[PDB]
Amino acid sequence: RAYDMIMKLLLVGDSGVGKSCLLLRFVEDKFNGIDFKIRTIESKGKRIKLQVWDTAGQERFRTITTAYYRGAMGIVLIYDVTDSRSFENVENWFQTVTQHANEDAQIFLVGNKCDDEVNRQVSKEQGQELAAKLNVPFLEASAKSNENVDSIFYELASIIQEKHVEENI
Amino acid sequence: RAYDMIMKLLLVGDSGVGKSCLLLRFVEDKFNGIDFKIRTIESKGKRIKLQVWDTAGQERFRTITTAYYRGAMGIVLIYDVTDSRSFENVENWFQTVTQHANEDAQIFLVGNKCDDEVNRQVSKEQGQELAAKLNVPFLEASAKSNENVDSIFYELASIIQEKHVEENI
Ligand SMILES: Nc1nc2c(ncn2[C@@H]2O[C@H](COP(=O)(O)OP(=O)(O)O)[C@@H](O)[C@H]2O)c(=O)[nH]1
Numbered sequence: 001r002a003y004d005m006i007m008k009l010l011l012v013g014d015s016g017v018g019k020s021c022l023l024l025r026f027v028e029d030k031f032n033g034i035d036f037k038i039r040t041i042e043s044k045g046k047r048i049k050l051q052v053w054d055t056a057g058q059e060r061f062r063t064i065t066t067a068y069y070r071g072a073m074g075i076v077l078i079y080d081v082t083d084s085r086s087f088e089n090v091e092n093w094f095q096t097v098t099q100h101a102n103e104d105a106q107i108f109l110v111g112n113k114c115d116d117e118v119n120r121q122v123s124k125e126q127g128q129e130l131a132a133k134l135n136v137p138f139l140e141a142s143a144k145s146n147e148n149v150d151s152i153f154y155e156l157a158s159i160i161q162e163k164h165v166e167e168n169i
Numbered sequence: 170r171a172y173d174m175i176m177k178l179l180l181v182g183d184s185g186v187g188k189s190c191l192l193l194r195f196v197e198d199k200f201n202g203i204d205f206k207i208r209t210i211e212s213k214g215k216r217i218k219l220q221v222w223d224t225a226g227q228e229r230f231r232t233i234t235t236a237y238y239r240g241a242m243g244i245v246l247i248y249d250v251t252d253s254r255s256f257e258n259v260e261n262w263f264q265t266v267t268q269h270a271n272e273d274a275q276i277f278l279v280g281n282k283c284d285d286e287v288n289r290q291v292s293k294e295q296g297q298e299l300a301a302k303l304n305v306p307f308l309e310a311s312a313k314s315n316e317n318v319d320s321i322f323y324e325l326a327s328i329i330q331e332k333h334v335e336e337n338i
């Protein structure tokens with residue numbers, strides 16, 4: 001059977017939070033500059049070719065490529081639970097994404113590096129607090145331990161499958 | 170060197186005009202259902218990963234997936250030069266694309282099957298006439314003879330490279 005849906009997922013976050021590692025762990029299942037990588041999944045019996053982008057780091061200074069944020073059905077806002085300054089910069093990310101992404105794009109907050117408990121600077125409850133203020137889902141994940149990594153994109157694909165628009169005519 | 174730009178190209182046209190053959194000829198160089206195929210090209214010294222979509226045929230009846238038309242930096246409107254009824258339906262395609270694609274998307278008119286001169290029903294001048302009325306570039310191509318097939322996506326990528334937006338901050 002051919003693919004039933006194609007979903008363009010966009011990874012955003014400060015440099016060093018684990019964006020390319022989360023991308024490598026989801027598609028290639030490994031652990032340890034503009035490109036996108038694909039992985040085929042099933043969601044409610046439908047074959048969906050996921051399109052995961054890692055394009056936030058190579059943008060020009062004080063510019064945004066507004067075409068990359070368009071068409072993106074899902075945006076994964078990633079921060080480092082071991083870096084409280086990356087968690088405090090989520091407000092800047094959420095403001096830029098919502099301004100340039102479209103109204104039907106779904107935002108998913110993710111606290112990466114949930115395995116590094118020795119260096120944890122942001123609680124799991126702090127991430128659940130910020131996510132419920134921005135009205136977005138939340139998950140703590142780790143590209144190292146593969147914890148909740150699949151559930152990030154599978155849950156986001158399930159929301160897009162429920163929310164994506166198919167306008168008449 | 171990593172990729173400098175990523176371009177989402179959308180192929181549209183009536184069923185049977187040669188959309189999937191033009192896609193197969195561009196990426197795989199061969200001749201003789203929702204998916205996209207990629208091919209890496211160079212445009213003015215920049216490595217661009219092209220993303221060619223063939224998604225017009227499997228849409229639901231009297232519906233459009235408005236997310237697929239968003240983010241698409243280029244739309245290739247294809248008709249059959251051996252099928253005058255497919256050329257007369259370009260007005261319907263151009264009206265739908267412009268309504269759901271964004272203002273910075275570039276439209277490229279293409280008359281496929283330029284090799285079949287025995288069955289030609291639309292002149293090359295008719296296609297140049299319709300294209301200059303819609304203010305879009307034009308090319309007559311053939312997935313069979315590989316004529317102007319590369320020039321379709323290379324010219325469209327050159328226009329997007331000149332037109333795509335990089336908004337400040
Ligand atoms: N412990 C741990 N370290 C991680 C995780 N993800 C990334 N890292 C480390 O963070 C460093 C930089 O991450 P990176 O992929 O470059 O993030 P990016 O620059 O935002 O894409 C890498 O060297 C990884 O070793 C994780 O889930 N757990």
Ligand SMILES: Nc1nc2c(ncn2[C@@H]2O[C@H](COP(=O)(O)OP(=O)(O)O)[C@@H](O)[C@H]2O)c(=O)[nH]1
Nearest residue numbers: 183184185186187188189190282285311312313
């Ligand atoms: N002579 C000729 N035939 C073509 C060309 N492109 C496609 N065809 C024929 O048109 C038929 C249907 O085209 P198809 O790829 O299904 O168009 P689509 O349904 O719009 O994607 C195929 O069986 C091809 O043999 C071309 O450039 N030249």
